[PDB]
Structures are given as C-alpha cells and as structure tokens.
Symmetry: C4
Subunit: 203 residues, 4 copies
Amino acid sequence: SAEELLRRSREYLKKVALIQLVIAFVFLILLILLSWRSEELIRELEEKGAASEAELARMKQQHMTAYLQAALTAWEIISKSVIALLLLQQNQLNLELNTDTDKNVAEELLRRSREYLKKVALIQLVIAFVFLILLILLSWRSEELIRELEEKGAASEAELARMKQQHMTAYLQAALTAWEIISKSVIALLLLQQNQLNLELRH
Amino acid sequence: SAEELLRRSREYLKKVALIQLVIAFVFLILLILLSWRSEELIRELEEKGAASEAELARMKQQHMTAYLQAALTAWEIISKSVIALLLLQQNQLNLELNTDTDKNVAEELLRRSREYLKKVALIQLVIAFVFLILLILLSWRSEELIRELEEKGAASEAELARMKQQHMTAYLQAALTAWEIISKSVIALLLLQQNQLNLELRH
Amino acid sequence: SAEELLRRSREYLKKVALIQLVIAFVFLILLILLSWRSEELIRELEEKGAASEAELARMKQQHMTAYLQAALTAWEIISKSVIALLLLQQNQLNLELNTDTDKNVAEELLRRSREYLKKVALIQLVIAFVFLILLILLSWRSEELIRELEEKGAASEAELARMKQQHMTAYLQAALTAWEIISKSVIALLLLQQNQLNLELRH
Amino acid sequence: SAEELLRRSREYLKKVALIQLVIAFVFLILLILLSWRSEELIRELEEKGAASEAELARMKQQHMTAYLQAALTAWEIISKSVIALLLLQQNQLNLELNTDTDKNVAEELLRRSREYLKKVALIQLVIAFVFLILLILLSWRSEELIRELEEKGAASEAELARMKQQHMTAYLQAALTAWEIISKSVIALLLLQQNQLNLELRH
C-alpha cells in the first residue's frame, strides 16, 4: 500500500512545485510588463508637458518604490514557498525512508535532498543579490531625480527635503524587509541541515 | 469515561464548524450589501451631477479596490478557518484513533477525513478561481473608466497616467496577496495529506 | 532536583501572569483616558466653531474608528497573552505532573487548569460581546452624523457619499478583525481542551 | 563519522550567527545615518524659513515617529534572531549530547547554554529599557512642539486638536506594539528556561 501512495504523494508534490514555478514566472513577467507601461506613461507625460518636473520626479519615485515593494513581497513569497518545498521534500523523504528502508535507497534519497538543499541556498543568494542591486540602483535614480529638481529649481526646499526624507524612509523599510527575508531563510536552512544530519546518521 | 469525553469534543467541533460557515456567509452577504450601497451612491452622484466624471471614476476605482481587499482579507480568514477546521478534525481523529483502536472505526474515521481533505482542496480551487475572475473583471472595469475619461477629456494626462499606474500597482498587490493565501493553503494541504497517509498506514 | 527547580519556574510564571494583568489594565486605562481627551477636543471645537459641521462629523468618525481599532489591537494582544499563559500553565503542569506523580496532586492540578481554561473561554465570550455591541453603537452614531449633515446641507452630495463609503469600509474592517481574533481564540481554546483531555485521561 | 559531522554543523551555526550580527549591525548604522540626514534637512528648513512653524513641528513629529517605528521593528527582528539562534544552539546541543553522552561533557555544554540564556535576557532588558526611554522622550518632544504652536498661535484649534490626536494615537500604538514584542520575548525566555531544566535533569 505505502509504495504506491508515496509515489502518488511524490507526484503531487512535484505538481505543486510546478505551480510555484508558474506563479513566480507570472509575477516576474507581470512585474516587468506593468513596470514597462508605467515607464512609458511617465515618458509620455514628460514629452507631452502634462506634468511639472517635480511632479514627474515624484511619480518616478512612486513607480520605483512600488516596483521594489512588489519585488520584496514576491521575494518573501518565493523564498517561503521554496523553503516550504524543501521542508515538504524532507517530509516526503522521511515517509519514503520509513517505508523503503534499504540503506542504498536511503543514501540516494539523502543525496538528492542535499542537492536540493544546496540549490535552495543558491536561490536565496540570487534573491539577496537582486535585492541589493535593485535597491542600490533605484536609490541612485531617486537621489538623481531629487538632484535634478534641485539643480533646476523645479521644487521648493521643503518639497525637496520631503522627497529626500520619503526616499530615505522607503530605503530603510526595504532594508528591514530584506533583512527579515534573509534572516528567516538562513535560519530555516540551518534547521533543514540539522534535520538532514539526523536522517543521515539514522541510515 | 474517554468515549463520552471524545463525543463531547467531537460535537463541539461540529458546532464550531457550523458557526464558521455561518460567519463566512454573513461576511459575504455584508460585503455584497455594502458594495451595493456604494454602487448606488456612485450611481446617484453620476445621475445627479454631484461629481465630475473624473471624480466618479476615481470613486469607482476606490470602491473596487476596497471590495477586493475585503474579499482578500476574508479569503485569508476563510481559508485559515477551513484549513484549521480540517486540522482540528485530524486532531480529533487522532484522539479517537488512539482510544477506540478498532480498525473498523479507524477506517470509518479515516475515510471521512480523506473526503474532508479532498473537499477543502476543492474549496481552495474555487477561491483561487473566484479571485482570478474577480480581479480580471475589476481590472477591465478600471481600464474602461480610464479610457472613458481620456477620450472625453475629463481628466488631465497626468491624472490619467496616475490612475493607470495606481491601478497597475493595486492589481499586482492583489495578485501577490492571493498568491500568498493560495500557497499557504496548498502547503497546509500537503502537510495534512502527509499526516493522513501516515495515519492510514499505521491503522 | 526538579521539585525545587520547578518551584522557581512556577513562581516565575505566576509573576509573569501578574505582570501581564497589570499591563493589560494600564493599556485599558490609557485608551480610556486618551479617548476622553479626544472627545473633549472635538466637543470644544464644535462649541467654538473651530471647524465646519462636516469636518466635525468627520473628526467624530475618525475618533470612533481609532478608538475601536485600539480596542481591537489591545484585545488581540490580551487574548494572545492570556492564551499563551494558559498554554504555559499546561507546559508547567506537565513538568510538575511528571515530577510529583502523586495522583492526588495531579487531580488538584488538573482541576485548577480546567477551571482556568473555562475562565479564559468566558473572557473571550465577554470580549466578543463587547466588540459586537461597541461596533453597533459606534456605527449608529456614524450613521446619525452623516444624516445630520445631509439634512442640514453641511456637505455636498459627493462628500456625503464619501463619508458613507469610508464608514462602510471601516465597519467591515472592524467586523473582519474581530472575526479573525475570535476565531483564532476559539481554535486555540479547542486545541487546549483536546490537550487537557489527554492529560486528564493519563492521570 | 558523527563527531566530524557535528563539528561541521557547529561551524555553520557560528557562521549563521555572524551573518545575522553583520546584517543587524549594518541596518542599525543605516538607521542612524539616515536619521541624521533627516534631522539636518529639517534644521535647514527651519533656519532658511522654508516652512511654517506648524509645518516644521509636524515634520519633526513625522521624523520621530518613523525613527521609533524602524528602531522598534529592528529590535523585534534582533530579538527574534537571537531566540532563533538559541533554539538552533539547543538543537545543536542535543545533537552533541546524544552522541557524546558523557555527563562531564554535558555539564560543560549545559553551563554554556545557561550563560547564553542569561545573555539574551540581558539583551531584552536593554531593548525594553531603550524603548521605554525613547518613547518617553519622543512623546515629550511632541507634546512640547504642540504646546508651543498653541501658545504662539502658529496653528488653529482644529489643527492643534488633530496634532494632539495624532500624538496620542502614535503613542498608544507604539506602546501596544512594544507590549506585544516584549511579551513574546518574555514567553520565549521562559520556554528556553523550561528546555534548560529538562536538559539539565536528563544529564
């Protein structure tokens, strides 16, 4: 009974992983397409003379901020779903290890588990990388927009100070969010490594 | 003593589940009612000339946004409540399986649990469906409102670009929220399936 | 060793519970005092003519909303704190029961736990009651304020519609918040009741 | 084999603790530097006459609020990170205690565990202390800014009432947020102490 039920369970877990990959794909494509439309709309307003330079700079900052917030939200979701897939794979691993008790099978299942564990760590390293590049890049652009207005006299001192303060607040918030994503992820990876050690020692 | 105590706990849980179904019903009716009242207020402002076309379109977008956010909040609560009930059913299942150890009772309890598990998965598929359809329809309405204002000249180009951008931001945020709800629900279902498999194999 | 070490832990837990009762009391008082100050500030603005009728009605609504949100927040913390103390007592109880294994001691300890569990359920029922009454009363006042402005012509039709919409939104959000708090509390209590049953059956 | 594997696992845990310490350090430096820039911008606006007295008071309040929120969030993250590390250390401790069962080794390891628990309790006491002092200071500064605007006639009665209400709200929210955080930390400290007891009783 267990071997077929485990096979069915394993196939469903793989289907779920495919669903997760599809959602991550849609998020990234949707993020990019919506961003493209926002950049094009701002470009049209600038070319049309539909907004003042200060208004355009603020809209560009709002765009960039929203872009990052969406990216961060997705990153938390993606890391959570992926780390959950790794934990779920460990539960699947244990169900199979407790059924097919052949040591040779257990070592191959454990080897596959280690490869997935490494891959997830690599995924988080990629996420941390893109976060840092995106925040650094968007921040430079935000500061450059404020400078452009200041150089041109497109905004009052209070308006410029507020843009600077609003930016710094968003920057700081992005850092808190990334901090939580990374921190939660590294703790989960260590827990998974400890679980992996016990399974290897037990087989 | 244990059997009557288990009966009382079992009956209590059934009552809790029934209460939650009633609450979810009331929420949905209340959201529909309040949404309708808003639709009527906007309709009268439009017919009466109490607001400009741009003001009315913005209010319609605010209405749709709030509607969806309430629906998403309830969906998180509903999926959490329903999956929690399923977990509570498994907890009750184990209390009885480890008391009344008759395999035939265990089989009745396990078959009922398996059916409940399938039904919850179907519930989440329905919720995900409704979310996607609702966001698509609301998105279509939002774009049409903007198109109307732009063709009529009811709003400046900067105002229209902002509505388009604000819409896209809200659209993406709604998608992210739904994805988080769906993912957590699927993970919980996988964990429950793993628990169900162990219980069936162990009895 | 454990009897004295547990004595110290038991004393600690009692001290923590007393501290939490005091803190919750202080927060209740702060909300009451802060609420008083706010109501008085609005009353004086009305008597002084420091704000228009529509603005005064809006401030009254903002006040009521903030009050309820604070009440809900405090309730969420209080129920989680009380439930955590209830869980901590079961954890402390298991440590004591497996040290002092005298059945007669276990019977007294189990009876005390059961009475506290019932008391906590009564506390949540009281909170749920208060929430429902409070939202209903605040809602009635909100509806009356909007109607007063409508009868007097204190606000444009679009402005009145916006107040009605903001009102309905806040109303529903409060209903959703209370639903989530109450349901989680009920779920936690049932899990504790199921755990209490196994512990009593084993002693 | 187990001893070398345990050594590698311990080395990784040390690395993880270093990763979290570095991120928290950098975040706190960022918080401080951005706050300093904000303060300098406000100082220039005041000296330049770029904003009214009421506008400057509001900006100072917004600054203080944002700081407190970021600081409190960072503290929450830090306390959670430390507890997570302590839990990982306890798991690591059991991996070692279940391999090297020599009571003499266990006592030295248990002595370190007790020291780490005391150290986190001291960390939380410092955080709770700083939060309270900071809340008092910032609240004091806020009240004084409002008082001066009222005496100077820099704001209308309705504007001042709103500032007082916003002040009271921010105060209570910060206090409630800190309450939840601190209470959770205290609960975690007790749970860790309960684990410390069982670890000692078993060796």
